[PDB]
Amino acid sequence: CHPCPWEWTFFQGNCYFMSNSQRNWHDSITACKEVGAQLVVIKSAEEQNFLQLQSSRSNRFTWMGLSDLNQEGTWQWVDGSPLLPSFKQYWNRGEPNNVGEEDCAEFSGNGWNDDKCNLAKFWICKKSAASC
Numbered sequence: 001c002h003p004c005p006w007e008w009t010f011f012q013g014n015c016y017f018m019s020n021s022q023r024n025w026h027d028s029i030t031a032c033k034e035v036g037a038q039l040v041v042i043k044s045a046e047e048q049n050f051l052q053l054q055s056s057r058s059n060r061f062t063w064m065g066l067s068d069l070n071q072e073g074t075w076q077w078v079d080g081s082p083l084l085p086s087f088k089q090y091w092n093r094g095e096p097n098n099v100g101e102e103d104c105a106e107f108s109g110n111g112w113n114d115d116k117c118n119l120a121k122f123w124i125c126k127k128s129a130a131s132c
């Protein structure tokens, strides 16, 4: 009984996969679903801190499961839930700014940025640990 699939990282009752290759946002959604997971939806400050670290330390741009594709200005996680006000602090300064039409959220530096969905970035999938 392993809490997570091999090579995935356990953190606080969930399993995370950190890609070692780059995909646009819609194809990153697909990849996560092919392994029974979701392009990462953040639920807490501690989780955000953990995820952000992965990117700030590796200097990689990394997609999360957050977008405003459906309605410009309305940021919605891929699980249907809306971006809570307490989380808007994590945007980088001046973001999100929709410049050139940017409807997908990424880890970038110390915070989040909106970027163009058809660019190729690393990605992180999330799913529940198994019970042990």
Ligand SMILES: [NH3+]Cc1cn([C@@H]2[C@@H](O[C@H]3C[C@H](C(=O)NCc4ccc(CO)cc4)[C@@H](C(=O)NCc4ccc(CO)cc4)C[C@@H]3OCCCl)O[C@H](CO)[C@@H](O)[C@@H]2O)nn1
Pocket: 061, 095, 097, 099, 100, 101, 102, 106, 108, 113, 114, 115
């Ligand atoms: N993690 C990658 C990243 C990407 N960001 C974007 C980046 O955007 C810039 C850079 C953007 C860009 O991709 N430019 C083309 C470009 C590509 C590659 C090079 C490398 O030589 C140079 C230029 C630029 C842009 O989106 N232009 C297209 C466009 C078309 C039409 C309109 C009007 O509807 C607007 C825009 C926009 C920004 O230029 C600022 C001065 Cl260079 O920086 C902003 C913070 O300032 C962020 O908010 C953005 O999301 N920040 N970080």
Ligand SMILES: [Ca+2]
Pocket: 068, 069, 072, 101, 103
């Ligand atoms: Ca749009």
Ligand SMILES: [Ca+2]
Pocket: 068, 069, 072, 073, 098, 101, 102, 103, 104, 114
């Ligand atoms: Ca947008």
Ligand SMILES: [Ca+2]
Pocket: 095, 096, 097, 098, 099, 102, 113, 114, 115
């Ligand atoms: Ca932006």
Ligand SMILES: [Cl-]
Pocket: 010, 011, 012, 013
């Ligand atoms: Cl832990």
Ligand SMILES: [Cl-]
Pocket: 018, 019, 020, 021
């Ligand atoms: Cl990968």
Ligand SMILES: [Cl-]
Pocket: none
């Ligand atoms: Cl770590």
